[PDB]
Design a protein around this ligand. Structure first.
Ligand SMILES: CCCCCCCCCCCCO[C@@H]1O[C@H](CO)[C@@H](O[C@H]2O[C@H](CO)[C@@H](O)[C@H](O)[C@H]2O)[C@H](O)[C@H]1O
Ligand SMILES: CCCCCCCCCCCCO[C@@H]1O[C@H](CO)[C@@H](O[C@H]2O[C@H](CO)[C@@H](O)[C@H](O)[C@H]2O)[C@H](O)[C@H]1O
Ligand SMILES: CCCCCCCCCCCCO[C@@H]1O[C@H](CO)[C@@H](O[C@H]2O[C@H](CO)[C@@H](O)[C@H](O)[C@H]2O)[C@H](O)[C@H]1O
Ligand SMILES: CCCCCCCCCCCCO[C@@H]1O[C@H](CO)[C@@H](O[C@H]2O[C@H](CO)[C@@H](O)[C@H](O)[C@H]2O)[C@H](O)[C@H]1O
Ligand SMILES: CCCCCCCCCCCCO[C@@H]1O[C@H](CO)[C@@H](O[C@H]2O[C@H](CO)[C@@H](O)[C@H](O)[C@H]2O)[C@H](O)[C@H]1O
Ligand SMILES: *C/C=C(C)/C=C/C=C(C)/C=C/C1=C(C)CCCC1(C)C
Ligand SMILES: *C/C=C(C)/C=C/C=C(C)/C=C/C1=C(C)CCCC1(C)C
Ligand SMILES: *C/C=C(C)/C=C/C=C(C)/C=C/C1=C(C)CCCC1(C)C
Ligand SMILES: *C/C=C(C)/C=C/C=C(C)/C=C/C1=C(C)CCCC1(C)C
Ligand SMILES: *C/C=C(C)/C=C/C=C(C)/C=C/C1=C(C)CCCC1(C)C
Ligand SMILES: CCCCCCCCCCCCCCCCCCCC
Lengths: 283, 283, 283, 283, 283
């Protein structure tokens, strides 16, 4: 059957206002996250610098995405009467997300495996497979939701959604299997945090498919608002919450290495205002 | 009853000029603050780096808020005759503030608890509760003032204002209780500054609700100008004044740690052209 | 009587070209200055880091000001016939200066007292008084020249000019008294430079009031060009010249501290290709 | 014979969407790459800093290129009916690539020779010859494809394509001869990676000429989409893949130098979560 | 007699394309140069940091200039028929150069004297005289070519050109005399490079007056293209070539100081993959 794309529904002044708030809130929060990433990049050892690199990429891409979207929002809707009517630039308030997710979901997978105990070419097979799975899941989703059918075809939305879901399961299994292998080889305190962070990431990835089911099932300005709120909220929680969790595991692992003599760190490491390791100079 | 939103009043050339000055002054001052934050980030220990992270986020978000607003001012008012008439972009000269405050007030709470003596999961409960309270206070305010009623409904403004005030009291109590617990455990010199900084932040938070009462009670170009001046002024004083106070406490606490052997700092710490601690080398 | 605001005069192609050159030249020079400030920030001790902070703020705000003005120039004049006719945003080619000066003149006062021998709360008193005086001098000027009268009233220009001049004398006395107290307590070489820098700053502050007297006395495209040239030139000389002088005094004072054991500096200090102090390691 | 330039074909909503995705994806990935380059610049010794410099230039130029192109895409196609019709700004969605490649291909050659064993004036002859060849190959291509004939002449496309191909062979021979001389003088582990990286770069350079043959042979919206996808994909693989490979060789060579006493490095070097060298202090 | 300003000639699609390429190529190359300057700023001692400061300013200003010009090109010409017709924004594709040169030529003089053996107030007289001469040469040129006559008067072009040439000779003599005094006091290897760099800078300064003689003698789209190519090419060669040469002399001088005990450098210095000096610790 046919449906109306989320970007093809007229918004009341409330709905217009809420959407601008959330878009701008999310873009702001991600710019904070970018600063935080750069300001705390030296708390982690070079053995774990991939986590900083991934997180930096996530924050940059996502910040651009939201800037674009906020601007395309101001130019995608015009206040005809009491309602705001979508232009052609309305789709540019939703479509940039998939660009962002195409970079971010692969990078989030890398961030997670960064602090796991995989090394050498083993930390290459899993990394490629995850990156592949992650990108393919977003790309298949983009096809169903924006490209094939114009985001107005239920059958396209359902088919490509199912494809995207297969890749989800694949990526998720790969990651979870990798973590499950690492947990035994980490210290208890690290292993515990890494389990939590795996749960958080997977659980946060479950929210995004809900914004997809809405597009299939419900159309309206309420539902366009819902989608924006859900996705914006999810972004703040995942890209601020999860990226803080990985930094703490990287810090904790750095500190463990320092104590073990595996490496030396220029500054002391504090986690929760407790000193984990002291500063040291190359002997 | 029904009233006119601050952004729905025609400005005289004076009022237009004053508003552009203050908007631009505030945006400029916050960009100075951002530079100051980055240039002085290494004066503080890693045990207190959260203060610089919070302050950096505050300065960044607030700076883009004001940039947006300054641009939306130049495009939100058209010089019909001697007066400037508000367009649709007029609300974009006021609404972005709430986006900024939604990030900033939570971050200001974090900045304050950064230099208090809470640690571990204790420095997590309070931090989440404050962040929650702070965000909810701004968000409820945004609803009354921009969303529910279009900022033209007294009853909406009064109801959501009262809600926002409850969350204010909650956040304030949480913070003040946290500080009151820390003061005994700080050194006299730090405790004194931390008391002051708590008073300054709370006192500065009282000014913002006045701009809200104006919107309820008075409409006009004078009153739109008043609101802009009050809020701009408050921003400069709180986001420059308070953020300097927390940096001094962080520096003083760093210096105390250095003297106690709790940690080492690469550079000497000067506060008021008095040396607080010397530079040291890791082990 | 009534006059015509500087931004209300049609420019010949010469005058249009000269103004664009100077605006762009000044904006470029200030961007060079900003780079220079960041690139040389580590030549100075932490006891004098306020000088870098002030100078960084000056350069940033002034650079934005000129960017804004250059853009408002390209869009504020339309080539009707041989002449360029001012639009409504012609005033945006002159008004942003006062925003800049409102930040910069206070910051320049701070930069100067940074390298003087005032310490503790004594530094605070003088710093607040100067900052107050400086801002009030610019703000009163802005009122007379842009706000009260629309920059078309001689009596407003004369009254607010006189007010602004009182605050000038106040700020100048405060600063000069502070310097005169420091000179005895500095080393001869530093004292000499600090005297010079005081003369340079005060002397440079005398040029700006001339652009104000023009606006009162003469109107025309020649006179609008004169104002732009004078103010642009003054900005380059004061914000490049003076800010270099303070850096040399900060470097020289850093070097004196290093030699005295008051502090240690990571790199050697060179002034005029003469080594002032050697690099040292913390303890 | 007369043919239609890639930028002179109307795109279906699918093709429009795909192209925007890929353009934006590539621009995002290159901005990630730029961050990665800056964040990992200190993993390499100063003997190999040219690799970082080249890679930084590549990432910056390419990121600008894609930003320009993404913006020119939004303004180069107007949605007349179901199809998007190319404007005059359509050529600005394709032509900027050649600007980018004119910088990037020479820089990629430099990046490769950076980690080879050529030194002194020998590392000047080869470097100039390669830079010359590389630039001339792109420039001759630009002439055929954009300038001489307007990208609508088969004979121009064929002639300048053949010229560009001669320069390709020249550059490729120069590079390959340089590598083949270095491989024997490198350590096995480095030599192996350097062989691989040479194959990757040369192989990636083969993809770009395919987008050229399309322009000669096929015109259409499908083919304009194909060109964009091919070139975007190639950019991500070459500018992320290859630039990672050279960094690993630079890290490995740094680590070898550290172990040999040829130099000292401030931080330990990890490659694949295996420590290659320890951190050391100057003398 | 009267002539047509370079910006008053209609461009064929070829000429339009070539000009956009070169403008964009030059802007890109200068952005690479800016990155290179920042990435290699720590290879040089603090005794020679002026070279980095000058080079940074050059690259920044020149990059802005070209960005402005590239944008003014896209908006300065309208595709009437097969030809592109210049509007009022066409002059903004040529005039910004003189702003850039007004900063850059003085800065290039400073960069050169940075690595010569002048010190104290001696390194002040020459520096001011050169800066004066350099700026006056560009400014007099701007008058003849853009301001006095509108770039349409041969006699103005000839008179101001002759003035500009006098200042050229003055600056050149000052510089050459300074170098000729330094060469004897440098080490052979440095002296040789410094001679070369002097020749390169002076020789590159000779190219710019040719673009001026064209404007006097020839008008046309070919000739406006020629001017753009010549000036763009000259910029790449001088601003990238010369600024590399000065960095090598600064590195070599740093290394000589390190070996002599005049100073210590934190990193080893490599020039052409040959180690010039080792890394050292302050004490
Ligand atoms: C809706 C919008 C709401 C916005 C909320 C934003 C605030 C939440 C983010 C706070 O981010 C905060 O970053 C600092 C960075 O030093 C972290 O702090 C961490 O590193 C510092 C620095 O070494 C250590 O002293 C500390 O023990 C450790 O917790 C905090 O653990 C984290 O809570
Ligand atoms: C309306 C517009 C008004 C604009 C006013 C702007 C000026 C106010 C901000 C001045 O910000 C100033 O920053 C410097 C930063 O080193 C601080 O200086 C502090 O750190 C330095 C650096 O270690 C120490 O040498 C010094 O003892 C200490 O005071 C000042 O305490 C603070 O006052
Ligand atoms: C019309 C506008 C034209 C503007 C042209 C440029 C104006 C002159 C700017 C030169 O700026 C120059 O900066 C360098 C920065 O290292 C300063 O140099 C200073 O620091 C360096 C670095 O430690 C020392 O080696 C040196 O002894 C000391 O003089 C110069 O004293 C200053 O003259
Ligand atoms: C048309 C556009 C084409 C653009 C091509 C640009 C070519 C030059 C850019 C790279 O230029 C190159 O920079 C590196 C920067 O580390 C310099 O390299 C120098 O410093 C490094 C870093 O300490 C040393 O390892 C090396 O021995 C030394 O030569 C090269 O000497 C220079 O030739
Ligand atoms: C389509 C869009 C898909 C986007 C995919 C993007 C992800 C691929 C790039 C990942 O980039 C990743 O960067 C880190 C940077 O520390 C590298 O990691 C490297 O350096 C770190 C830091 O010293 C070492 O601990 C590690 O051993 C080494 O592998 C990874 O080798 C690389 O894989
Ligand atoms: C920071 C951004 C994140 C974590 C985005 C995640 C997005 C997904 C996990 C998307 C998954 C999808 C499906 C499984 C079904 C089809 C629709 C998608 C693309 C939303
Ligand atoms: C830097 C910005 C700051 C400190 C902003 C603070 C804003 C408040 C404390 C707002 C509080 C409000 C109420 C208590 C009542 C409703 C209106 C609000 C949102 C202004
Ligand atoms: C870098 C900018 C500087 C130093 C600006 C300084 C401006 C002044 C000192 C202005 C003073 C004025 C008066 C004393 C009279 C009224 C007019 C003013 C504002 C120009
Ligand atoms: C990162 C960008 C890269 C590596 C671009 C490479 C481009 C080429 C190798 C282009 C070569 C061409 C020919 C050999 C024939 C004519 C067409 C060209 C310019 C595409
Ligand atoms: C990177 C920019 C540089 C080096 C620019 C240099 C420009 C000149 C040396 C210009 C000189 C001129 C004359 C000597 C006479 C005619 C007018 C000028 C301005 C082109
Ligand atoms: C069309 C622009 C051409 C490039 C600008 C001119 C470059 C001249 C460089 C001369 C170098 C001479 C070096 C002599 C060494 C003995």
């Amino acid at each position: 059957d046919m449906i109306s794309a989320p970007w093809e529904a007229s918004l009341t002044q409330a709905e217009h206002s809420l959407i601008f708030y959330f878009l701008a809130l999310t873009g702001s929060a991600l710019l904070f996250g970018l600063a935080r990433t750069w300001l705390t990049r030296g708390e982690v050892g070079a053995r774990y610098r991939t986590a900083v690199v991934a997180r930096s990429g996530i924050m940059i891409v996502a910040t651009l995405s939201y800037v674009f979207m906020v601007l395309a929002f101001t130019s995608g809707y015009d206040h005809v009467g009491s309602l705001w009517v979508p232009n052609s630039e309305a789709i540019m308030t939703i479509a940039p997300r998939y660009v962002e997710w195409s970079i971010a979901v692969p990078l989030l997978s890398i961030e997670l495996l960064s602090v796991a105990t995989l090394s050498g070419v083993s930390a290459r097979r899993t990394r490629l497979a995850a990156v592949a799975g992650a990108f393919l899941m977003i790309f298949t989703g983009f096809l169903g939701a924006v490209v094939i059918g114009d985001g107005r075809s239920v059958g396209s939305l359902i088919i490509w959604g199912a494809i995207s879901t297969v890749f989800w399961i694949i990526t998720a299994v790969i990651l979870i299997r990798a973590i499950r292998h690492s947990l035994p080889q980490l210290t208890p305190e690290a292993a515990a945090l890494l389990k939590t962070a795996t749960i958080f990431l997977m659980s946060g990835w479950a929210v995004y498919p809900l914004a997809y089911l809405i597009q299939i099932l419900f159309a309206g300005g309420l539902w366009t608002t819902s989608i924006h709120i859900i996705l914006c909220t999810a972004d703040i929680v995942v890209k601020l919450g999860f990226c803080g969790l990985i930094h703490r595991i990287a810090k904790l692992r750095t500190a463990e290495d320092v104590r073990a003599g595996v490496d030396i760190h220029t500054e002391a490491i504090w986690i929760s205002s407790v000193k984990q390791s002291d500063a040291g100079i190359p002997t």
